[PDB]
Amino acid sequence: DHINLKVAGQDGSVVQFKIKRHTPLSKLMKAYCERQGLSMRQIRFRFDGQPINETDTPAQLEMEDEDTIDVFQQQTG
Amino acid sequence: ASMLDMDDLATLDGQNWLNDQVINMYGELIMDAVPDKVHFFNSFFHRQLVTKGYNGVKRWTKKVDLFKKSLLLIPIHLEVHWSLITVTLSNRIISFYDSQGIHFKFCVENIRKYLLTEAREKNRPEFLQGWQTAVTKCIPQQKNDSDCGVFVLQYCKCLALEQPFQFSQEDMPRVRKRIYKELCECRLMD
């Protein structure tokens, strides 16, 4: 029951992940951070524009194989 | 709607600059309160539509019929600055609000293209034409260099609850405090 997920950044980068549709996405978010050198209070994970909570699963977000998660940066103004 | 980390809330503190978590969370509160009438796009929508076109924001309206709403609010982020685009569906008028007189009509055309595209996919013939730019109107301007986010959120509250701009620069400290408490409660405390 694995799924493939892409994580796309403001730099155009793309990173692939396998994850079970019912594991919480916190392990992918923490994996993606450590791998890219990112600070997780400075970036935001979004699927179809909706925020992703640590506890959320690919299942309860209704993701499918090869769907894309976007990562955005802090904005101030 | 949900609760913010204490350091995001802190961007409301004093004369700190509001960040995207404050903007987007208050948007959530606003359309939590009048959901049949207002749709609030988050502050990442515009950059995404601009750098990746309709195909990059197509799925963000997956659960929304934009065209049953009365008011779309779209916060615009410009480097160091917060501004606001609004779409009133009844009369097809796209407006640009900014608390420092900045004119960026260059980006309300991106919005117009977006709306005509969405209307095509959602099989909405009544919205394949007719969009106007808004005739600019006197709205309350800021007198410091840090309250643009606060002004933008107050325009949103007023437009959403259909109130007049009955505020000025001297109210901003109180509004920073009101927005703060509304955020801790996850509800608009009218």
PDB file of C-alpha atoms in Angstrom:
ATOM      1  CA  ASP A   1       0.000   0.000   0.000  1.00  0.00           C
ATOM      2  CA  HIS A   2       2.710   2.513  -0.899  1.00  0.00           C
ATOM      3  CA  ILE A   3       2.210   5.762  -2.832  1.00  0.00           C
ATOM      4  CA  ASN A   4       4.553   8.064  -4.732  1.00  0.00           C
ATOM      5  CA  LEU A   5       4.551  11.754  -3.890  1.00  0.00           C
ATOM      6  CA  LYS A   6       6.418  14.713  -5.370  1.00  0.00           C
ATOM      7  CA  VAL A   7       7.503  17.728  -3.307  1.00  0.00           C
ATOM      8  CA  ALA A   8       8.022  20.835  -5.446  1.00  0.00           C
ATOM      9  CA  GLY A   9       9.849  23.938  -4.258  1.00  0.00           C
ATOM     10  CA  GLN A  10       9.991  27.650  -5.134  1.00  0.00           C
ATOM     11  CA  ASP A  11      13.415  26.878  -6.670  1.00  0.00           C
ATOM     12  CA  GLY A  12      11.844  24.526  -9.214  1.00  0.00           C
ATOM     13  CA  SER A  13      13.366  21.488  -7.459  1.00  0.00           C
ATOM     14  CA  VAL A  14      11.323  18.278  -7.263  1.00  0.00           C
ATOM     15  CA  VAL A  15      11.859  15.344  -4.868  1.00  0.00           C
ATOM     16  CA  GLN A  16      10.112  11.966  -4.860  1.00  0.00           C
ATOM     17  CA  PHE A  17       8.923   9.938  -1.862  1.00  0.00           C
ATOM     18  CA  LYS A  18       7.272   6.591  -1.185  1.00  0.00           C
ATOM     19  CA  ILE A  19       4.855   6.627   1.742  1.00  0.00           C
ATOM     20  CA  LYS A  20       1.926   4.525   2.863  1.00  0.00           C
ATOM     21  CA  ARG A  21      -1.371   6.320   2.240  1.00  0.00           C
ATOM     22  CA  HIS A  22      -2.204   6.068   5.972  1.00  0.00           C
ATOM     23  CA  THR A  23       1.063   7.101   7.634  1.00  0.00           C
ATOM     24  CA  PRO A  24       0.896  10.724   8.830  1.00  0.00           C
ATOM     25  CA  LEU A  25       2.739  13.129   6.550  1.00  0.00           C
ATOM     26  CA  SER A  26       4.946  14.424   9.374  1.00  0.00           C
ATOM     27  CA  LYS A  27       7.680  11.923   8.473  1.00  0.00           C
ATOM     28  CA  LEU A  28       7.753  13.139   4.849  1.00  0.00           C
ATOM     29  CA  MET A  29       7.811  16.794   5.908  1.00  0.00           C
ATOM     30  CA  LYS A  30      10.587  16.139   8.391  1.00  0.00           C
ATOM     31  CA  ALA A  31      12.467  14.033   5.831  1.00  0.00           C
ATOM     32  CA  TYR A  32      12.161  16.758   3.166  1.00  0.00           C
ATOM     33  CA  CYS A  33      13.439  19.389   5.582  1.00  0.00           C
ATOM     34  CA  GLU A  34      16.542  17.480   6.721  1.00  0.00           C
ATOM     35  CA  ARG A  35      17.434  16.599   3.116  1.00  0.00           C
ATOM     36  CA  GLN A  36      17.178  20.152   1.723  1.00  0.00           C
ATOM     37  CA  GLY A  37      18.651  22.002   4.690  1.00  0.00           C
ATOM     38  CA  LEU A  38      15.347  23.794   5.322  1.00  0.00           C
ATOM     39  CA  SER A  39      14.004  25.187   8.604  1.00  0.00           C
ATOM     40  CA  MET A  40      10.470  23.995   9.021  1.00  0.00           C
ATOM     41  CA  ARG A  41       9.201  27.211  10.617  1.00  0.00           C
ATOM     42  CA  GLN A  42      10.251  29.044   7.446  1.00  0.00           C
ATOM     43  CA  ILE A  43       8.478  26.836   4.853  1.00  0.00           C
ATOM     44  CA  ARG A  44       4.928  25.664   4.372  1.00  0.00           C
ATOM     45  CA  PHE A  45       3.679  22.409   2.871  1.00  0.00           C
ATOM     46  CA  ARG A  46       0.541  22.676   0.776  1.00  0.00           C
ATOM     47  CA  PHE A  47      -1.441  20.184  -1.311  1.00  0.00           C
ATOM     48  CA  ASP A  48      -3.805  21.770  -3.853  1.00  0.00           C
ATOM     49  CA  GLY A  49      -3.374  25.009  -1.890  1.00  0.00           C
ATOM     50  CA  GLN A  50      -4.631  23.537   1.381  1.00  0.00           C
ATOM     51  CA  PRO A  51      -2.254  23.359   4.367  1.00  0.00           C
ATOM     52  CA  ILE A  52      -0.980  19.972   5.507  1.00  0.00           C
ATOM     53  CA  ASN A  53      -0.971  19.240   9.219  1.00  0.00           C
ATOM     54  CA  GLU A  54       1.620  16.976  10.809  1.00  0.00           C
ATOM     55  CA  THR A  55      -1.095  14.418  11.578  1.00  0.00           C
ATOM     56  CA  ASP A  56      -2.688  14.448   8.116  1.00  0.00           C
ATOM     57  CA  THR A  57      -2.482  11.336   5.946  1.00  0.00           C
ATOM     58  CA  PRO A  58      -2.338  11.025   2.165  1.00  0.00           C
ATOM     59  CA  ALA A  59      -5.618   9.138   2.626  1.00  0.00           C
ATOM     60  CA  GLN A  60      -7.552  11.831   4.440  1.00  0.00           C
ATOM     61  CA  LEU A  61      -6.158  14.440   2.040  1.00  0.00           C
ATOM     62  CA  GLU A  62      -7.393  12.199  -0.835  1.00  0.00           C
ATOM     63  CA  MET A  63      -4.033  12.135  -2.551  1.00  0.00           C
ATOM     64  CA  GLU A  64      -3.307   9.610  -5.286  1.00  0.00           C
ATOM     65  CA  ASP A  65      -0.204   8.166  -6.880  1.00  0.00           C
ATOM     66  CA  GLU A  66       2.271  10.757  -8.199  1.00  0.00           C
ATOM     67  CA  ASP A  67       0.394  13.760  -6.746  1.00  0.00           C
ATOM     68  CA  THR A  68       2.445  16.881  -5.984  1.00  0.00           C
ATOM     69  CA  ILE A  69       2.966  18.728  -2.689  1.00  0.00           C
ATOM     70  CA  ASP A  70       4.104  22.361  -2.969  1.00  0.00           C
ATOM     71  CA  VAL A  71       6.515  23.992  -0.496  1.00  0.00           C
ATOM     72  CA  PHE A  72       6.349  27.769  -0.042  1.00  0.00           C
ATOM     73  CA  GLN A  73       8.363  30.321   1.938  1.00  0.00           C
ATOM     74  CA  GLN A  74       7.565  32.707   4.729  1.00  0.00           C
ATOM     75  CA  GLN A  75       6.232  36.010   3.432  1.00  0.00           C
ATOM     76  CA  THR A  76       6.361  39.255   5.387  1.00  0.00           C
ATOM     77  CA  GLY A  77       5.309  42.739   4.361  1.00  0.00           C
TER      78      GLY A  77
ATOM     79  CA  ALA B   1      -9.609  26.709  10.784  1.00  0.00           C
ATOM     80  CA  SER B   2      -6.852  26.024  13.349  1.00  0.00           C
ATOM     81  CA  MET B   3      -4.370  27.604  15.763  1.00  0.00           C
ATOM     82  CA  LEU B   4      -1.026  29.278  14.951  1.00  0.00           C
ATOM     83  CA  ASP B   5       2.381  28.940  16.530  1.00  0.00           C
ATOM     84  CA  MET B   6       3.111  31.671  19.032  1.00  0.00           C
ATOM     85  CA  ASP B   7       5.816  33.137  16.824  1.00  0.00           C
ATOM     86  CA  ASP B   8       3.410  33.680  13.906  1.00  0.00           C
ATOM     87  CA  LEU B   9       1.013  35.448  16.251  1.00  0.00           C
ATOM     88  CA  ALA B  10       3.949  37.582  17.335  1.00  0.00           C
ATOM     89  CA  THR B  11       4.036  39.200  13.868  1.00  0.00           C
ATOM     90  CA  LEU B  12       0.968  41.135  15.051  1.00  0.00           C
ATOM     91  CA  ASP B  13       2.913  42.362  18.042  1.00  0.00           C
ATOM     92  CA  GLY B  14       3.807  46.030  18.270  1.00  0.00           C
ATOM     93  CA  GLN B  15       4.634  47.274  14.796  1.00  0.00           C
ATOM     94  CA  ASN B  16       5.973  43.955  13.514  1.00  0.00           C
ATOM     95  CA  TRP B  17       5.230  42.967   9.928  1.00  0.00           C
ATOM     96  CA  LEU B  18       2.442  40.488   9.393  1.00  0.00           C
ATOM     97  CA  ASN B  19       3.544  37.254   7.793  1.00  0.00           C
ATOM     98  CA  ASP B  20       1.658  34.755   5.684  1.00  0.00           C
ATOM     99  CA  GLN B  21       0.370  32.640   8.577  1.00  0.00           C
ATOM    100  CA  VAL B  22      -1.485  35.611  10.032  1.00  0.00           C
ATOM    101  CA  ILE B  23      -2.869  36.676   6.643  1.00  0.00           C
ATOM    102  CA  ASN B  24      -3.972  33.207   5.616  1.00  0.00           C
ATOM    103  CA  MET B  25      -5.367  32.188   8.998  1.00  0.00           C
ATOM    104  CA  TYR B  26      -7.511  35.322   9.265  1.00  0.00           C
ATOM    105  CA  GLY B  27      -8.746  34.653   5.762  1.00  0.00           C
ATOM    106  CA  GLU B  28      -9.843  31.229   6.990  1.00  0.00           C
ATOM    107  CA  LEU B  29     -11.667  32.872   9.910  1.00  0.00           C
ATOM    108  CA  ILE B  30     -13.376  35.310   7.578  1.00  0.00           C
ATOM    109  CA  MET B  31     -14.785  32.677   5.276  1.00  0.00           C
ATOM    110  CA  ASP B  32     -15.492  30.356   8.179  1.00  0.00           C
ATOM    111  CA  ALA B  33     -17.968  33.074   9.158  1.00  0.00           C
ATOM    112  CA  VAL B  34     -19.693  33.799   5.831  1.00  0.00           C
ATOM    113  CA  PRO B  35     -18.880  30.741   3.715  1.00  0.00           C
ATOM    114  CA  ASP B  36     -21.674  30.941   1.167  1.00  0.00           C
ATOM    115  CA  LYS B  37     -20.694  34.485   0.246  1.00  0.00           C
ATOM    116  CA  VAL B  38     -16.901  34.854   0.491  1.00  0.00           C
ATOM    117  CA  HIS B  39     -14.042  32.785  -0.840  1.00  0.00           C
ATOM    118  CA  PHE B  40     -10.535  33.664   0.364  1.00  0.00           C
ATOM    119  CA  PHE B  41      -7.554  32.561  -1.703  1.00  0.00           C
ATOM    120  CA  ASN B  42      -4.409  32.162   0.338  1.00  0.00           C
ATOM    121  CA  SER B  43      -1.376  34.412  -0.074  1.00  0.00           C
ATOM    122  CA  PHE B  44       0.473  31.807  -2.177  1.00  0.00           C
ATOM    123  CA  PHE B  45      -2.241  31.675  -4.854  1.00  0.00           C
ATOM    124  CA  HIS B  46      -0.988  34.643  -6.850  1.00  0.00           C
ATOM    125  CA  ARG B  47       2.694  33.673  -7.093  1.00  0.00           C
ATOM    126  CA  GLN B  48       1.601  30.170  -8.071  1.00  0.00           C
ATOM    127  CA  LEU B  49      -0.811  31.379 -10.762  1.00  0.00           C
ATOM    128  CA  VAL B  50       1.872  33.732 -12.081  1.00  0.00           C
ATOM    129  CA  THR B  51       4.848  31.367 -12.123  1.00  0.00           C
ATOM    130  CA  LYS B  52       2.888  28.253 -13.135  1.00  0.00           C
ATOM    131  CA  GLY B  53      -0.286  29.511 -14.832  1.00  0.00           C
ATOM    132  CA  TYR B  54      -3.816  28.176 -14.615  1.00  0.00           C
ATOM    133  CA  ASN B  55      -2.463  24.638 -14.495  1.00  0.00           C
ATOM    134  CA  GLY B  56      -0.655  25.454 -11.237  1.00  0.00           C
ATOM    135  CA  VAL B  57      -3.792  26.633  -9.395  1.00  0.00           C
ATOM    136  CA  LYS B  58      -6.411  24.559 -11.218  1.00  0.00           C
ATOM    137  CA  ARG B  59      -6.853  22.097  -8.383  1.00  0.00           C
ATOM    138  CA  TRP B  60      -7.088  24.720  -5.571  1.00  0.00           C
ATOM    139  CA  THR B  61     -10.772  25.356  -6.431  1.00  0.00           C
ATOM    140  CA  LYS B  62     -11.499  21.619  -6.465  1.00  0.00           C
ATOM    141  CA  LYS B  63     -14.124  22.047  -3.762  1.00  0.00           C
ATOM    142  CA  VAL B  64     -15.350  25.559  -4.594  1.00  0.00           C
ATOM    143  CA  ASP B  65     -17.823  26.925  -7.096  1.00  0.00           C
ATOM    144  CA  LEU B  66     -16.278  30.379  -7.263  1.00  0.00           C
ATOM    145  CA  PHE B  67     -19.241  31.691  -9.192  1.00  0.00           C
ATOM    146  CA  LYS B  68     -21.866  31.017  -6.521  1.00  0.00           C
ATOM    147  CA  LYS B  69     -19.932  33.309  -4.206  1.00  0.00           C
ATOM    148  CA  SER B  70     -20.429  37.056  -3.829  1.00  0.00           C
ATOM    149  CA  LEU B  71     -16.849  38.091  -2.983  1.00  0.00           C
ATOM    150  CA  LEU B  72     -13.430  36.637  -3.707  1.00  0.00           C
ATOM    151  CA  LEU B  73     -10.563  38.039  -1.622  1.00  0.00           C
ATOM    152  CA  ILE B  74      -7.042  37.575  -2.960  1.00  0.00           C
ATOM    153  CA  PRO B  75      -4.116  38.852  -0.866  1.00  0.00           C
ATOM    154  CA  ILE B  76      -1.220  40.028  -3.030  1.00  0.00           C
ATOM    155  CA  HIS B  77       2.371  39.858  -1.784  1.00  0.00           C
ATOM    156  CA  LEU B  78       4.903  42.243  -3.436  1.00  0.00           C
ATOM    157  CA  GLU B  79       8.418  41.677  -2.083  1.00  0.00           C
ATOM    158  CA  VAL B  80       8.032  43.633   1.122  1.00  0.00           C
ATOM    159  CA  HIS B  81       4.390  44.467   0.949  1.00  0.00           C
ATOM    160  CA  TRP B  82       0.815  43.270   1.409  1.00  0.00           C
ATOM    161  CA  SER B  83      -2.010  44.329  -0.880  1.00  0.00           C
ATOM    162  CA  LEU B  84      -5.447  43.062  -1.805  1.00  0.00           C
ATOM    163  CA  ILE B  85      -7.443  42.161  -4.923  1.00  0.00           C
ATOM    164  CA  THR B  86     -11.209  41.625  -4.657  1.00  0.00           C
ATOM    165  CA  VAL B  87     -13.693  40.192  -7.151  1.00  0.00           C
ATOM    166  CA  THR B  88     -17.369  41.044  -6.667  1.00  0.00           C
ATOM    167  CA  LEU B  89     -19.255  38.526  -8.794  1.00  0.00           C
ATOM    168  CA  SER B  90     -22.623  40.287  -9.032  1.00  0.00           C
ATOM    169  CA  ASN B  91     -21.208  43.050 -11.254  1.00  0.00           C
ATOM    170  CA  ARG B  92     -17.913  41.493 -12.457  1.00  0.00           C
ATOM    171  CA  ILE B  93     -15.656  44.146 -10.935  1.00  0.00           C
ATOM    172  CA  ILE B  94     -12.062  43.384  -9.966  1.00  0.00           C
ATOM    173  CA  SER B  95     -10.628  45.879  -7.477  1.00  0.00           C
ATOM    174  CA  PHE B  96      -7.166  46.552  -6.099  1.00  0.00           C
ATOM    175  CA  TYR B  97      -6.849  47.886  -2.513  1.00  0.00           C
ATOM    176  CA  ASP B  98      -3.564  49.167  -1.066  1.00  0.00           C
ATOM    177  CA  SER B  99      -2.912  51.192   2.095  1.00  0.00           C
ATOM    178  CA  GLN B 100       0.106  53.032   0.586  1.00  0.00           C
ATOM    179  CA  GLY B 101      -1.312  54.246  -2.746  1.00  0.00           C
ATOM    180  CA  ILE B 102       0.571  51.594  -4.781  1.00  0.00           C
ATOM    181  CA  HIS B 103      -1.063  50.992  -8.177  1.00  0.00           C
ATOM    182  CA  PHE B 104      -0.479  47.481  -9.541  1.00  0.00           C
ATOM    183  CA  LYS B 105      -3.116  47.081 -12.213  1.00  0.00           C
ATOM    184  CA  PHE B 106      -0.524  44.945 -14.035  1.00  0.00           C
ATOM    185  CA  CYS B 107      -1.617  41.996 -11.885  1.00  0.00           C
ATOM    186  CA  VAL B 108      -5.420  42.332 -11.931  1.00  0.00           C
ATOM    187  CA  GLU B 109      -5.211  41.190 -15.551  1.00  0.00           C
ATOM    188  CA  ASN B 110      -3.681  37.898 -14.417  1.00  0.00           C
ATOM    189  CA  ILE B 111      -6.774  37.630 -12.232  1.00  0.00           C
ATOM    190  CA  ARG B 112      -9.097  38.454 -15.128  1.00  0.00           C
ATOM    191  CA  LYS B 113      -7.471  35.782 -17.251  1.00  0.00           C
ATOM    192  CA  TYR B 114      -7.786  33.401 -14.315  1.00  0.00           C
ATOM    193  CA  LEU B 115     -11.521  34.042 -13.897  1.00  0.00           C
ATOM    194  CA  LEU B 116     -12.329  33.630 -17.600  1.00  0.00           C
ATOM    195  CA  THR B 117     -10.359  30.376 -17.591  1.00  0.00           C
ATOM    196  CA  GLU B 118     -12.073  29.017 -14.471  1.00  0.00           C
ATOM    197  CA  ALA B 119     -15.440  29.977 -15.976  1.00  0.00           C
ATOM    198  CA  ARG B 120     -14.612  27.914 -19.064  1.00  0.00           C
ATOM    199  CA  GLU B 121     -13.769  24.756 -17.057  1.00  0.00           C
ATOM    200  CA  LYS B 122     -16.686  25.121 -14.630  1.00  0.00           C
ATOM    201  CA  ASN B 123     -19.034  25.446 -17.660  1.00  0.00           C
ATOM    202  CA  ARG B 124     -20.172  28.914 -16.655  1.00  0.00           C
ATOM    203  CA  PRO B 125     -21.233  30.863 -19.777  1.00  0.00           C
ATOM    204  CA  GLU B 126     -22.542  33.839 -17.767  1.00  0.00           C
ATOM    205  CA  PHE B 127     -18.915  34.656 -16.718  1.00  0.00           C
ATOM    206  CA  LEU B 128     -17.059  34.309 -20.050  1.00  0.00           C
ATOM    207  CA  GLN B 129     -17.209  38.106 -20.443  1.00  0.00           C
ATOM    208  CA  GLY B 130     -17.908  41.307 -18.620  1.00  0.00           C
ATOM    209  CA  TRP B 131     -15.022  41.726 -16.182  1.00  0.00           C
ATOM    210  CA  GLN B 132     -14.201  45.334 -15.271  1.00  0.00           C
ATOM    211  CA  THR B 133     -11.397  47.022 -13.415  1.00  0.00           C
ATOM    212  CA  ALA B 134     -12.618  49.052 -10.452  1.00  0.00           C
ATOM    213  CA  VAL B 135     -12.662  52.842 -10.549  1.00  0.00           C
ATOM    214  CA  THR B 136     -10.220  53.689  -7.754  1.00  0.00           C
ATOM    215  CA  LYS B 137     -11.789  54.955  -4.524  1.00  0.00           C
ATOM    216  CA  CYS B 138     -10.563  56.700  -1.405  1.00  0.00           C
ATOM    217  CA  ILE B 139      -9.858  54.052   1.221  1.00  0.00           C
ATOM    218  CA  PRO B 140      -7.992  54.533   4.507  1.00  0.00           C
ATOM    219  CA  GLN B 141      -4.243  54.928   3.971  1.00  0.00           C
ATOM    220  CA  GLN B 142      -1.484  54.134   6.423  1.00  0.00           C
ATOM    221  CA  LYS B 143       0.818  56.745   7.940  1.00  0.00           C
ATOM    222  CA  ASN B 144       3.592  54.360   9.052  1.00  0.00           C
ATOM    223  CA  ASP B 145       5.515  51.746   7.053  1.00  0.00           C
ATOM    224  CA  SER B 146       4.450  48.565   8.843  1.00  0.00           C
ATOM    225  CA  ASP B 147       0.652  48.287   8.897  1.00  0.00           C
ATOM    226  CA  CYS B 148      -0.089  47.178   5.322  1.00  0.00           C
ATOM    227  CA  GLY B 149      -0.899  43.636   6.391  1.00  0.00           C
ATOM    228  CA  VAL B 150      -3.174  44.975   9.130  1.00  0.00           C
ATOM    229  CA  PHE B 151      -4.893  47.285   6.679  1.00  0.00           C
ATOM    230  CA  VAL B 152      -5.401  44.440   4.232  1.00  0.00           C
ATOM    231  CA  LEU B 153      -7.013  42.207   6.861  1.00  0.00           C
ATOM    232  CA  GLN B 154      -9.317  44.988   8.034  1.00  0.00           C
ATOM    233  CA  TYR B 155     -10.438  45.661   4.433  1.00  0.00           C
ATOM    234  CA  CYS B 156     -11.232  41.942   4.239  1.00  0.00           C
ATOM    235  CA  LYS B 157     -13.263  41.929   7.419  1.00  0.00           C
ATOM    236  CA  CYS B 158     -15.199  45.016   6.383  1.00  0.00           C
ATOM    237  CA  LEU B 159     -15.905  43.744   2.860  1.00  0.00           C
ATOM    238  CA  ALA B 160     -16.827  40.283   4.147  1.00  0.00           C
ATOM    239  CA  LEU B 161     -19.281  41.473   6.805  1.00  0.00           C
ATOM    240  CA  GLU B 162     -20.470  44.211   4.385  1.00  0.00           C
ATOM    241  CA  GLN B 163     -19.436  47.118   6.696  1.00  0.00           C
ATOM    242  CA  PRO B 164     -17.971  50.478   5.632  1.00  0.00           C
ATOM    243  CA  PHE B 165     -14.327  51.385   6.065  1.00  0.00           C
ATOM    244  CA  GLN B 166     -14.949  53.100   9.420  1.00  0.00           C
ATOM    245  CA  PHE B 167     -11.329  53.127  10.545  1.00  0.00           C
ATOM    246  CA  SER B 168      -8.007  54.955  10.259  1.00  0.00           C
ATOM    247  CA  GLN B 169      -4.339  54.702  11.191  1.00  0.00           C
ATOM    248  CA  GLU B 170      -5.025  55.446  14.875  1.00  0.00           C
ATOM    249  CA  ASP B 171      -7.169  52.323  15.175  1.00  0.00           C
ATOM    250  CA  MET B 172      -4.394  49.987  13.995  1.00  0.00           C
ATOM    251  CA  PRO B 173      -2.979  49.165  17.475  1.00  0.00           C
ATOM    252  CA  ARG B 174      -6.450  48.141  18.621  1.00  0.00           C
ATOM    253  CA  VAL B 175      -6.958  46.147  15.435  1.00  0.00           C
ATOM    254  CA  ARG B 176      -3.662  44.303  15.803  1.00  0.00           C
ATOM    255  CA  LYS B 177      -4.946  43.338  19.262  1.00  0.00           C
ATOM    256  CA  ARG B 178      -8.394  42.341  17.998  1.00  0.00           C
ATOM    257  CA  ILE B 179      -6.966  40.236  15.161  1.00  0.00           C
ATOM    258  CA  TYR B 180      -4.683  38.576  17.718  1.00  0.00           C
ATOM    259  CA  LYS B 181      -7.522  37.523  20.000  1.00  0.00           C
ATOM    260  CA  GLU B 182      -9.743  36.475  17.097  1.00  0.00           C
ATOM    261  CA  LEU B 183      -6.888  34.222  15.989  1.00  0.00           C
ATOM    262  CA  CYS B 184      -6.437  32.657  19.454  1.00  0.00           C
ATOM    263  CA  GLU B 185     -10.179  31.891  19.556  1.00  0.00           C
ATOM    264  CA  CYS B 186     -10.526  30.782  15.898  1.00  0.00           C
ATOM    265  CA  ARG B 187     -13.578  33.009  15.530  1.00  0.00           C
ATOM    266  CA  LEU B 188     -14.363  36.588  14.474  1.00  0.00           C
ATOM    267  CA  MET B 189     -15.068  38.567  17.647  1.00  0.00           C
ATOM    268  CA  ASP B 190     -17.301  41.276  16.212  1.00  0.00           C
TER     269      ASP B 190
END
